[PDB]
Design a protein around this ligand. Structure first.
Ligand SMILES: NC(=O)c1ccc[n+]([C@@H]2O[C@H](COP(=O)([O-])OP(=O)(O)OC[C@H]3O[C@@H](n4cnc5c(N)ncnc54)[C@H](OP(=O)(O)O)[C@@H]3O)[C@@H](O)[C@H]2O)c1
Ligand SMILES: NC(=O)c1ccc[n+]([C@@H]2O[C@H](COP(=O)([O-])OP(=O)(O)OC[C@H]3O[C@@H](n4cnc5c(N)ncnc54)[C@H](OP(=O)(O)O)[C@@H]3O)[C@@H](O)[C@H]2O)c1
Lengths: 377, 397
């Protein structure tokens, strides 16, 4: 049960905490990242001196292979940035290490992500007997596990999938890249494109109430549509307050959302990253699913609500880092326990959702089901 | 001597170079020196006069400036670099016995507070050396004080109320851009408002007080009260003034962008460590924002800047409104810049002309209202900034 965490950010902080909380499964833990001091901060916060740390540039396959051959992990949990997905997978192949991440690949010079890059590794991973688990955060991640759970127990055919993500509380480089692209959803065999944050409507969230929700593309639509060909329409919605949208608009207008490197006193700075250097309540994230069971239409809503305060008291991080870090740990737990072992490259919906859902209820993300309700869309 | 040296090759310096080159009878030898020499050479190529010399200089370095001054031997140095360079350039002018003019008074790099004490401190040294320093000779500061001196000289026994009003009614068709150096521009407009009334200076919140004011050829515009450096010297030099305020128009989209820039920390003036390098966020913002110097091509509309003055003549209250409207497109066609660079650059050239012609000769450190306004006002009509007068109208203020 040797696990290596790459990335000492908000998510990695949560993953480390949750891995440490399950030492019967995770007997040996290391945290490696670009800035080692953040790794050591996490170890001190957890209070477990047995967690090892290391500096590594995960853009460098050779550095990674040396680290992997030193610590000898059985799985690496990549919660660095999407840019590191492929170099880490390369190192995993060469050092015969299994793999898990929470976000699929996008190149540094283009804010477009898709699964082709990582799916390309399927046969190499398979012939090496290695398992890769892609997109095992909350969304992507629990959102596809929720959908697999519904398909397994409640639906003959899933026909409409609507993922809803509300942060009702009170990494910006990858975050602002995600939300500024054209919207995109799936309907009747085709991918449909909107303007950025053009389509929106009020959706009512448990314990929160109605919130302005905006349609945008999201990674998991690509694989969920592929893996559930009964789907007639799949969309993803996220809430955005007016002040947030205003700040987002201005940031773009002034040039601080740029993703190319600019030259500033002999140093290569990308405006969006420099912005990062300067930049109560709860989340509610789930899936609203409609389809057929025993010849009749049926609706289903399954969700988690995560309190920012409770997440902070446990891990020092807020609800967005918490909801992503917990499932990443559980994915590794499923592999270590043999519940999720499938040589090749896998999306979460391809595994048995039941043992994962059972752990979510025990590891800080209890989920709730509403049957036969009005899904509002 | 007739030799003039221009420091700063930005938007204002581009205009100043064009305007001095247009008056070769006065300015017989011209040099443009600036931190980045290629921009000096860009200006000379645009003007088409190979006789204009260029040079690289770091105007933060008194030694470098003195060497440049003793080589070129200017009679006056027109400082249109940043306020930060005001004192080092004045130091060098004193050491090399060269006269001085700028369009903005000093603020330290580490504090967004400007005032005249720094430069007034050089008065007796300049005076003893026979050197004249002309401070704040742009449009506002500059023409705004020359307008005031003009009104005091010709139309009032006693001026009592001064309101300077500044509207940029143009459209540069950018989501957001500033009209001059964004670093200096943003530092200025984000401070607390201040004005003068009944013997005291009153502080307001930033952009707290605003009125609808009607601008010639433009109409009503949302106008905001803020401090402006010429209020300090004009209140000093015209004691009869009872109330002095400065107003500038801001559109809603502009204010929205300005608010967000401050909230996200990109208006900060302190240095942060970014990959072992010291970076001032406001200075980084300048790098990505549109360059004011490149806006003229798609700039339409015009500016309107003037002074609304009220006071007594022969015991009766009178009003006076004097202003200039400047077409962004005409400024662009003439100089490649836009109306804010133009309104600032033309009066800087004229102040130097007044010195070269002997009209404005006053050893020491001077604000523009201390000179005879008449010959300056005459040149404004001839050098591209004609002004208009309205007598006894409603000042709305
Ligand atoms: N599926 C979901 O629900 C979900 C939700 C949110 C986020 N995520 C994903 O989670 C990941 C982490 O997010 P976060 O918020 O924790 O980000 P973060 O706070 O910026 O942390 C990223 C970490 O990766 C490190 N890193 C970056 N480049 C590296 C390199 N070349 N070599 C080694 N380490 C490197 C960073 O090092 P430094 O300390 O030097 O900066 C930092 O410690 C991202 O991929 C994000 O897309 C997924
Ligand atoms: N009175 C008024 O009505 C009024 C109105 C607007 C502006 N102004 C003033 O006019 C001045 C010029 O503004 P602008 O918009 O033209 O600014 P700008 O476009 O940024 O140009 C300033 C110039 O100074 C140069 N410079 C900066 N630091 C220097 C240093 N250490 N040594 C030498 N040169 C240096 C810059 O060089 P680089 O090319 O290397 O950047 C640039 O060429 C400012 O002081 C501003 O406050 C006055």
């Amino acid at each position: 049960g040797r696990v290596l965490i790459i990335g000492a950010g908000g998510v990695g902080t949560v993953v480390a905490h949750k891995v440490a909380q399950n030492a019967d499964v995770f007997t040996d833990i290391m945290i490696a990242s670009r800035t080692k001091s953040k790794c050591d901060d996490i170890v001190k916060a957890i209070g477990n001196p047995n967690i090892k740390t290391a500096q590594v540039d995960a853009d460098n396959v050779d550095e990674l292979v040396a680290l992997f051959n030193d610590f000898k992990p059985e799985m690496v949990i990549n919660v660095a940035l999407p840019y590191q997905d492929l170099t880490i997978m390369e190192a995993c192949l060469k050092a015969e290490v299994n793999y898990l991440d929470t976000a699929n690949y996008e190149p540094k010079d283009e804010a477009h992500f898709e699964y082709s890059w990582q799916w390309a590794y399927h046969e190499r991973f398979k012939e090496a007997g290695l398992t890769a688990i892609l997109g095992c955060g909350f969304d992507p991640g629990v959102s596809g596990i929720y959908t697999a759970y519904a398909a397994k127990h409640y639906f003959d055919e899933i026909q409409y999938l609507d993922i809803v993500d509300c942060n009702a509380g009170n990494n910006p480089e990858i975050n602002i890249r995600e939300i500024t692209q054209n919207g995109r959803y799936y309907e009747n065999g085709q991918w449909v494109t909107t303007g950025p944050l053009e389509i929106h409507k009020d959706l009512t969230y448990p314990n929160i109430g109605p919130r302005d929700s905006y349609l945008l593309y999201h990674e998991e639509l690509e694989s969920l549509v592929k893996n559930f060909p009964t789907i007639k329409r799949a969309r993803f919605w996220m809430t955005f307050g007016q002040e947030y949208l205003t700040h987002l608009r201005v940031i773009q207008n002034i040039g601080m959302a740029r993703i190319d490197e600019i030259d500033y006193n002999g140093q290569k700075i990308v405006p969006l990253q420099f912005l990062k250097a300067v930049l109560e309540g709860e989340t509610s994230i789930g899936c609203r699913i409609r389809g057929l069971k025993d010849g009749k239409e049926r609706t289903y809503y399954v969700y988690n609500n995560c309190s920012h305060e409770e997440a902070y008291k446990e891990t020092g991080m807020q609800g967005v880092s918490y909801t992503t870090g917990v499932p990443a740990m559980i994915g590794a737990m499923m592999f270590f326990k043999g519940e999720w072992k499938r040589p090749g490259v896998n999306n979460v919906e391809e595994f048995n959702p039941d043992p994962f859902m059972e752990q979510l209820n025990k590891q800080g993300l209890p989920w709730h089901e509403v049957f036969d309700g009005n899904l509002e869309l």
